[PDB]
Amino acid sequence: EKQIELIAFYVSHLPQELAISQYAVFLENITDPDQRQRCLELAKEAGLDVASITKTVVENTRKKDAGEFAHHDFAPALDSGTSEEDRAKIDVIDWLVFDPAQRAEALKQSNAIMRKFLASKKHEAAKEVFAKIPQDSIAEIYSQWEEQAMDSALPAEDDNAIREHLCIRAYLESHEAFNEWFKHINSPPQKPTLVGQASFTEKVAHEHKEKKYEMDFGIWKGHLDALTSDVKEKIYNVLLFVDGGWMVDVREDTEEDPERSHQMVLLRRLCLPMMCFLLHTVLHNTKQYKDCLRLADIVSSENQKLYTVFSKTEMRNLLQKLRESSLMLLDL
Amino acid sequence: LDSPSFTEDITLSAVMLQEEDPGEAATMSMYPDFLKSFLEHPSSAVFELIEQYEAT
Amino acid sequence: MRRSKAEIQRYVENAQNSASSPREKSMKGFLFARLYYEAKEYELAKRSVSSYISVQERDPKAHRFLGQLFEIEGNVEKAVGCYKRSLELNPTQKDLTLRIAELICTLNIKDGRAEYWVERASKLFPGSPEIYRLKEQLLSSQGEAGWNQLFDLIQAELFARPNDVYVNLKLVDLFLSNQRLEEAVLHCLKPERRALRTDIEWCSCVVRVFKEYLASKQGQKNTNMRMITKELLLAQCDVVFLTLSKKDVQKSKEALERFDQALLSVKQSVSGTDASDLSVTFYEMRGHYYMHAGTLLLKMAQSCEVQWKALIEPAALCYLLAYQVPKPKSKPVKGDDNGQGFLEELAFDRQSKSGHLLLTLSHGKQNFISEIIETFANQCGQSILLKFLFEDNLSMQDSFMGSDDISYVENRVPDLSELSQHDNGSLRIHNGDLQHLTWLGLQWHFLSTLPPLRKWLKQIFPRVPQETSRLESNIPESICLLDLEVFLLAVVQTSYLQLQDNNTTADPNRPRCLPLPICKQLFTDRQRSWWDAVYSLITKKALPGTSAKLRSVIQHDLTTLRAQEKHGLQPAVLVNWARGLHKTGYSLNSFYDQKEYMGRCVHYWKKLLPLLDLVKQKKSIPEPVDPLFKHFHNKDIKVSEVKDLEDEACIAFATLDLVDGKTEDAIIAFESVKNVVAYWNLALIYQRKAEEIENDCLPAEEQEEFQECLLKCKGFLKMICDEYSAYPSIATSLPVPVETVFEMLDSVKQSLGEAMDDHSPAFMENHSVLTTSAIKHSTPSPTKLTISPSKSARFSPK
Amino acid sequence: IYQRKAEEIENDCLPAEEQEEFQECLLKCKGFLKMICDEYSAYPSIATSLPVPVETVFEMLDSVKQSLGEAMDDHSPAFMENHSVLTTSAIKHSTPSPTKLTISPSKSARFSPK
């Protein structure tokens, strides 16, 4: 009957576990942001646990899709655009961002959603989730922990979630820089062509077009070299991620989440070989063939153990790509 | 200032005559009034609350 | 929530205890530095960013942030060092080059680094006002060599920006410092400087320079002295006007006193027989003096220094004296239109303002001007006026007002047709200012008369088409005069409602609308931003590079004006537009203009009908968070008024079909509404049908049709008289005085002759056949021109 | 139409812009009158389709030549080469359906029957 104003009060008379679950299922049907805020106000006025409710709403929406991690064949599947079901999973994060006290849980749940989107190669949907998390969230989580007068280190879950969020940031930044570089390298200035019987006026017009092309090519190359340096730095920040490597927990004093641990290992096996192939492609196309070969030293390094995340097929393909770069060095 | 008892009743009766079921709408209109009456009365005034439900 | 120092420190300690290496601790140092900065702990922020910079020496953001920390401490040299390092690492930071130049000039102007950084900044931001200020500071320190370079810099900046008040003031001060008073005067006299007359510092500087020049040349009878005295009186008048608007009452008294003394000094040089340009300017400036004196009295009442009641009659005398000053008689001297047309424009502005204020101050009292003349148009009344304005500071002999003759004042009430002519003259000086247009529109609205917005808009926008065939377009280049007219009608209405809601507690002697200098902003900053964008785009006065931003502002709010999807307009605004356009369109003798106004009136009625259905359903109308026109809940359409507005919409549809020449569809539509306004339109249609049949040799069939048309006309006119006899309140709904209905009824009786008074055939018993098919008022979708030539349009506008 | 447009512009003190518009209207009038004379010279049967005697067309053509003066007889700009842009949208000759009177007062009808 759409009597929204009355629901929070009658739900407060239920047992706490039933109140949380029943109110969460109600809030899942609310799409309008002004109504969302009004329902949280009413839940707070009724003395309901708003924090457990908004957490449960996000978990229910996250659990609605038991889509198995599709075994991806080696096709460059074009960026599968954000679906309406993906949009519902993005917009559920707003529930946890409303209360600053929930920033730790907002970060944990956003990481869990981004893990699914990254495994499905939905990079734009993962960026939309990342942009819902306010940039101060890490500082706010530390501030709230310090205010609770705990001389103890942060909970190992929240420290691992902060680290995971930083891993996802480094990956998204490297993919964005690569896409900017990839758009720029495919847009070179066109060399002016002389028609084979040009008049004196057309020869002078060609000389002016040729001088303009030399200038425009100089600028295009200078921007390409800058973008190449930026993409190289960003991909190295992923491959050489500090203190135990990318998508690896540093704190072992957490409860065992086997699903999260499995997802992190899977993402390492998908993302790190890809980033190494993208970096080889950047360095090879920019004629940095000596730095292509240093990728063998980085992948074989005992410090990061990156060779453990490669399949035998991907390792063979990497060595074949490195050989293509060595052949260009012999031609030099 | 000054005098409600005949014009408001005619307007509300005329509005409910435009509803597809005036009996269901009368029932629906009382849901907020019952909750409001419950919230206005402390747990010590339970009989004043029932008198307010009777009046509603 | 600001994080406490203790929360940040606990977060930093936890983040440092979790880090495996000293390098990993230092890598988090930039985040810690930002947290300490948000906590205002600048020393901890510096330590944290310095520990980060020792691991990431090539990060420009860290060096920039360290420079900001040193700048907040006042350590300018270390800040400049950190900013240089950031700029070396990333040269794309153009803003940092300007900040380095500013900081070096602030530290030591004699530093040879300052010239390098200012010139490097000048190449990055050509024509920045801040770079001009830094170059001025450098060159001002260099003595005579600096003077020539500063002169060249000022000339270059005035060439790029002729209307910059600050650069123009500096050129004048630079002439004065070199004793070149004649060049300062020549620069102030330049016609391009008329745009600077809206600035108080410029007008005060011009006044200073001209007084100093006139003092230096005392004793030389030069033609140049009369010209400078003329421009001094104009500049004094501008200082008074600007001080009345931008300053307090006391500064306005002192400004008027200096203008009074200036007029007194010129009075002895102006014999009443000399048709000299100075004499013409002196009498024009006398009218402005009294207009400003009346405005100062109303300002003193507004500041609660004096009661309204005590200052209304003295202020009304001052506006009467200002209104009656004769316009400069233009001899069109073939060849130099720029000087004499300006005094005529000022005279029109004075007469418009003073005349509307006299009508406002009278409150509709018939003898008000006569009572004021008898009471105050004498030497005792002058002495009272002098005491109100200047207290004991000026004597009757030391004042222009005290020595002036005010006894010869005519008992002349402002005529509305003359005021409409004066308003058209005043628009030239204000150049389409929205405050001026809204103020005039309010004056006409308080008189219950429609403002002549069409004439005003054609004068301001002579190249804009009256209507567009593409009402669904939001392209800025598709704007028509009707879009600007509805914009002004809504601004005037919203300003009127805002004045009423603020006036419910005001003194009964308070003027309904205050004079322009002391009147609060009548419109919103969004209405300003839209109008100024339209004006700048259409007049091609837009600054280079701003045109894309101006187009986006226009495009957004043009959707609202055309009532496109989700327009967010209050229904009362659409009703006011439709009524305003209906009245304006009906008053026009041009078929094409009538059709355009009626077509646009009908467009707003069609957009209003679905909102009236929501009001009938008791549903709320959606209000925008930031509306172009404010919603006023005191004007929300009541469910009782919905039927009368549906009937008014039907009348407007029938009037459009009549103007389109679909006379039969219009008759059927008017007969369906069964209202006095519809019967009046039916009577007019049947009268015109009878006059079209009236040729001096009719066949018997055409004589029967003529008589039937006159009988139908008599029938509808009688229905109007019968309804008026039952309800005399209907006289307010009639488009014409009831006398015109009686005169037309008696003319139709004379044409029918006495012989038919006894046979009324039952006028309504025989048209009970044609069931309900929704008459689709289709506007034609654009189907390609197929010329079929065989119906000459039967409708000539006689 | 172009003759009446020229007569509406004919006031004894025109700005230079209004003088160019006046001359353009007279040139357009001369152009259409010449087309009538050229068609009549090809097919004299057209005299029966003309709303006026052909003599009135010649009298009007000679008055328009006198008003243009002798100084412009040698520069015909190609009278038809520059309006080849606007595709096919069926011009709906809509008669107005009866929409209720909304009075907007701002276009005095410019057409007096002189």
Residue A318 amino acid letter: L
Record the tokens describing residue C278, joined without a space. Answer: 């100075």
Which residues in chain A have Cβ-Cβ distances shorter than 8 Å to B28? 1, 3
Q: List phi, psi (to 5°) of C60.
A: -60, -30
Q: How far apart are CA A41 and CA A5, in angstroms?
A: 10
Q: How far apart are CA C445 and CA C489, in angstroms?
A: 10
Interfacial A residues in 5-64 facing B (CB < 8 Å): 5-6, 9
Q: Tell me which DSSP letter residue C409 carries.
A: -
Q: How far apart are CA C765 and CA C625, in angstroms?
A: 55
Record the tokens describing residue C684, joined without a space. Answer: 């007019």
User: Between chains, do A3 and B39 touch, taking CB under 8 Å as contact?
Assistant: no
Count other Cβ atoms within 10 Å, centred on residue A207.
12
DSSP letters for C586-631:
HT---HHHHHHHHHHHHHHHHHHHHHHHHHHTTPPPPPPSS-SS--
Q: How far apart are CA A251 and CA A244, in angstroms?
A: 11
Record the tokens describing residue A39, joined without a space. Answer: 């329902």
Which residues in chain D have Cβ-Cβ distances shorter than 8 Å to C586? 101, 103, 105
The size of chain D, in residues, is 114
Q: Is A159 on the interface with C (CB under 8 A)?
A: yes
The size of chain C, in residues, is 798
Q: How far apart are CA D27 and CA D67, in angstroms?
A: 10
Across the interface, of C8, C24, C27, the residue whose CB is closest to A143 is C8
Which residues in chain A have Cβ-Cβ distances shorter than 8 Å to B35? 6, 9
> Which residues are within 8 A (CB) of C784 and not within 5 positions of it... i.e. 6 or more apart?
D88, D89, D90, D91
Q: List phi, psi (to 5°) of D90.
A: -45, 105
- Nearest CA to C446 out of C524, C506, C364 is that of C364
Residue with tokens 């409710």, as numbered in its chain: A53
Q: How far apart are CA C125 and CA C133, in angstroms?
A: 13
The answer to whether residues A292 and A283 touch, using CB atoms and an 8 Å cutoff, is yes
Count other Cβ atoms within 10 Å, centred on residue A168.
25
Nominal resolution (angstroms): 6.9
Q: Tell me which DSSP letter residue C2 carries.
A: P
Which residues in chain A have Cβ-Cβ distances shorter than 8 Å to C7? 142-147
Measured between alpha carbons, how far is residue C184 from residues C157, C209, C235 in Å? Answer: 17, 7, 15
Record the tokens describing residue A182, joined without a space. Answer: 């990839």
Q: How far apart are CA A156 and CA A168, in angstroms?
A: 18
Reported as type and span, the H/E element at residue A19 is helix A16-27
The three-state secondary structure class of C783 is strand
Q: Contact partners of D by the rule of 3+ C-beta pairs under 8 A?
A: C
Cα-based angle C256, C261, C262 (whole degrees, multiple of 5): 95
Residue D12 amino acid letter: D
Q: Rounded to a whole number, what is the largest CA-CA distance in chain D?
A: 55
The three-state secondary structure class of C51 is helix
Candidates A2, A6, A10, A45, partner chain B, best to mutate (most B CBs within 10 A): A6
DSSP letters for A123-143:
HHHHHHHHHHS-TTHHHHHHH
- Nearest CA to A304 out of A315, A295, A291 is that of A295
Residue with tokens 């190609």, as numbered in its chain: D78
Across the interface, of C7, C19, C23, the residue whose CB is closest to A146 is C7
The answer to whether residues C211 and C231 touch, using CB atoms and an 8 Å cutoff, is no
Which chain B residue is nearest to residue A46, measuring alpha carbons? B39
The answer to whether residues A64 and A115 touch, using CB atoms and an 8 Å cutoff, is no
> Which residues are within 8 A (CB) of C102 and not within 5 positions of it... i.e. 6 or more apart?
C130, C134
The answer to whether residues A332 and A290 touch, using CB atoms and an 8 Å cutoff, is no
Record the tokens describing residue C382, joined without a space. Answer: 């002058």
Q: How far apart are CA C27 and CA A208, in angstroms?
A: 50
Record the tokens describing residue C717, joined without a space. Answer: 């006119």
Record the tokens describing residue C232, joined without a space. Answer: 């001094």
Residue A139 amino acid letter: A
Judged by phi (left if over 0) then psi (alpha if -120 to 50, else beta), residue C196 lies in alpha
The three-state secondary structure class of D99 is strand
Reported as type and span, the H/E element at residue D104 is strand D103-104
Q: How far apart are CA D79 and CA D85, in angstroms?
A: 15
Which residues in chain C have Cβ-Cβ distances shorter than 8 Å to D102? 577-582, 585, 598, 600-602, 604-605, 648, 652
Looking from the CA of A24 toward its CB, the CA atoms found within 13 Å total: 22
DSSP letters for A289-307:
HHHHHHHHHHHH-TTT-GG
Measured between alpha carbons, how far is residue C667 from residues A8, C650, C689 in Å? Answer: 60, 12, 12
Residue C582: strand pairing partners: D103
User: Between chains, do D104 and C591 touch, taking CB under 8 Å as contact?
Assistant: no
Interfacial C residues in 599-618 facing D (CB < 8 Å): 599-602, 604-606
Burial (CB < 10 A; 0-12, 13-18, 19+), residue C218, is exposed
Judged by phi (left if over 0) then psi (alpha if -120 to 50, else beta), residue A32 lies in beta
Q: How far apart are CA C12 and CA C6, in angstroms?
A: 10
> Which residues are within 8 A (CB) of C650 and not within 5 positions of it... i.e. 6 or more apart?
C669, C672, C673, C678, D98, D99, D100
DSSP letters for C440-461:
HHHHHHHTTS---HHHHHHHH-
Count other Cβ atoms within 10 Å, centred on residue C362.
18
Query: How far, in whole angstroms, is CA C192 from its chain's centroid?
Result: 23
The answer to whether residues C244 and C297 touch, using CB atoms and an 8 Å cutoff, is no
The answer to whether residues C330 and C394 touch, using CB atoms and an 8 Å cutoff, is no
The answer to whether residues A138 and A165 touch, using CB atoms and an 8 Å cutoff, is yes
Measured between alpha carbons, how far is residue A10 from residues A7, B25, B34 in Å? Answer: 6, 21, 12
Buried b vs exposed e over C447-476: b needs ≥16 C-beta within 10 Å?
Answer: eeebbbbbbbbbebbeebebbbeebebbeb
The answer to whether residues C659 and C797 touch, using CB atoms and an 8 Å cutoff, is no
Q: How many helices (H) and strands (E) does chain C have?
A: 34, 0
> Which residues are within 8 A (CB) of A158 and not within 5 positions of it... i.e. 6 or more apart?
A104, A107, A108, A141, A145
Record the tokens describing residue C99, joined without a space. Answer: 């900040």
Cα-based angle C452, C458, C459 (whole degrees, multiple of 5): 95
Q: How many helices (H) and strands (E) does chain D have?
A: 3, 1
- Nearest CA to C492 out of C573, C414, C566, C432 is that of C573
What sign does the dihedral C306-C309-C314-C319 (CA atoms) show? positive
In angstroms, what is the C-alpha Rg of chain D? 19
Q: List phi, psi (to 5°) of A147.
A: -65, -30
Chains C and A touch (3+ CB pairs under 8 A): yes
The answer to whether residues C769 and C762 touch, using CB atoms and an 8 Å cutoff, is no
Q: How far apart are CA A180 and CA A158, in angstroms?
A: 33
Q: How far apart are CA C84 and CA C37, in angstroms?
A: 21
Q: How far apart are CA A278 and CA A180, in angstroms?
A: 13
Looking from the CA of C700 toward its CB, the CA atoms found within 13 Å total: 0
Cα-based angle C158, C159, C163 (whole degrees, multiple of 5): 50
Buried b vs exposed e over C630-665: b needs ≥16 C-beta within 10 Å?
Answer: ebbeebebeeeebeebbbbbbbbbbbbbbbbbbbeb
Q: How far apart are CA D84 and CA C278, in angstroms?
A: 59
Burial (CB < 10 A; 0-12, 13-18, 19+), residue C318, is buried
Query: How far, in whole angstroms, is CA A186 from its chain's centroid?
Result: 24
Q: How far apart are CA B12 and CA B34, in angstroms?
A: 19
Q: How far apart are CA C562 and CA C461, in angstroms?
A: 19
Record the tokens describing residue D90, joined without a space. Answer: 């069926």
CA dihedral D36, D40, D43, D48 (to 10 degrees): 90
Residues of chain C that touch chain A, judged by Cβ-Cβ distance less than 8 Å = 1, 3-4, 6-12, 14-15, 17-21, 23-24, 27, 31, 34-35, 38
The three-state secondary structure class of C790 is coil
Q: How far apart are CA C350 and CA C426, in angstroms?
A: 8
The answer to whether residues C7 and A142 touch, using CB atoms and an 8 Å cutoff, is yes
Record the tokens describing residue C595, joined without a space. Answer: 């059709």
Residue C653: strand pairing partners: D99
Query: How far, in whole angstroms, is CA C626 from its chain's centroid?
Result: 20
What sign does the dihedral C16-C18-C21-C25 (CA atoms) show? negative
Q: Tell me which DSSP letter residue C162 carries.
A: T
Interfacial D residues in 75-104 facing C (CB < 8 Å): 88-104
- Nearest CA to A120 out of A263, A247, A277, A239 is that of A263
Judged by phi (left if over 0) then psi (alpha if -120 to 50, else beta), residue C683 lies in alpha
Which residues in chain C have Cβ-Cβ distances shorter than 8 Å to A151? 10
What's the gap in Å between the CA of C9 and the closest CA on chain A?
A: 7
Q: List phi, psi (to 5°) of A249.
A: -70, 145
Q: Tell me which DSSP letter residue D18 carries.
A: H
Q: Tell me which DSSP letter residue D72 carries.
A: G
Cα-based angle C334, C346, C196 (whole degrees, multiple of 5): 95
Cα-based angle C222, C226, C230 (whole degrees, multiple of 5): 160
- Nearest CA to C466 out of C479, C477, C456 is that of C479
- Nearest CA to C118 out of C583, C132, C107 is that of C132
Which chain A residue is nearest to residue C27, measuring alpha carbons? A242
| Range list of H helices, C189-307 | 200-216, 223-246, 249-267, 277-302
Q: Tell me which DSSP letter residue C513 carries.
A: S
> Which residues are within 8 A (CB) of A81 and not within 5 positions of it... i.e. 6 or more apart?
A124
Q: How far apart are CA A310 and CA A294, in angstroms?
A: 17
The size of chain B, in residues, is 56
Q: List phi, psi (to 5°) of D99.
A: -90, 130
Q: How far apart are CA D83 and CA D74, in angstroms?
A: 23
Q: How far apart are CA C15 and CA C24, in angstroms?
A: 10
Across the interface, of D89, D99, D105, the residue whose CB is closest to C652 is D99
Across the interface, of C3, C4, C20, the residue whose CB is closest to A243 is C20
DSSP letters for C626-674:
S-SS---GGGPPPTTTHHHHHHHHHHHHHHHHHHTT-HHHHHHHHHHH-
Q: How far apart are CA B25 and CA B14, in angstroms?
A: 13
Q: List phi, psi (to 5°) of A209.
A: -65, -35
Q: Is C790 on the interface with D (CB under 8 A)?
A: no
Q: How far apart are CA C200 and CA C85, in angstroms?
A: 44
The three-state secondary structure class of C414 is coil
Q: Contact partners of A by the rule of 3+ C-beta pairs under 8 A?
A: B, C
What's the gap in Å between the CA of D8 and the closest CA on chain C?
A: 15
User: Between chains, do A242 and C35 touch, taking CB under 8 Å as contact?
Assistant: no
Count other Cβ atoms within 10 Å, centred on residue C765.
7
DSSP letters for C361-399:
HHTT-TTHHHHHHHHHSSHHHHHHHHHHHHTTSS-TTT-
Which chain B residue is nearest to residue A5, measuring alpha carbons? B32
Q: How far apart are CA C81 and CA C96, in angstroms?
A: 12
Count other Cβ atoms within 10 Å, centred on residue C360.
19
Reported as type and span, the H/E element at residue C13 is helix C5-17
Which chain D residue is nearest to residue C583, measuring alpha carbons? D103
The answer to whether residues A159 and A251 touch, using CB atoms and an 8 Å cutoff, is yes
Query: How far, in whole angstroms, is CA C275 from its chain's centroid?
Result: 36
Record the tokens describing residue C455, joined without a space. Answer: 């004439």
User: Between chains, do A6 and B28 touch, taking CB under 8 Å as contact?
Assistant: no
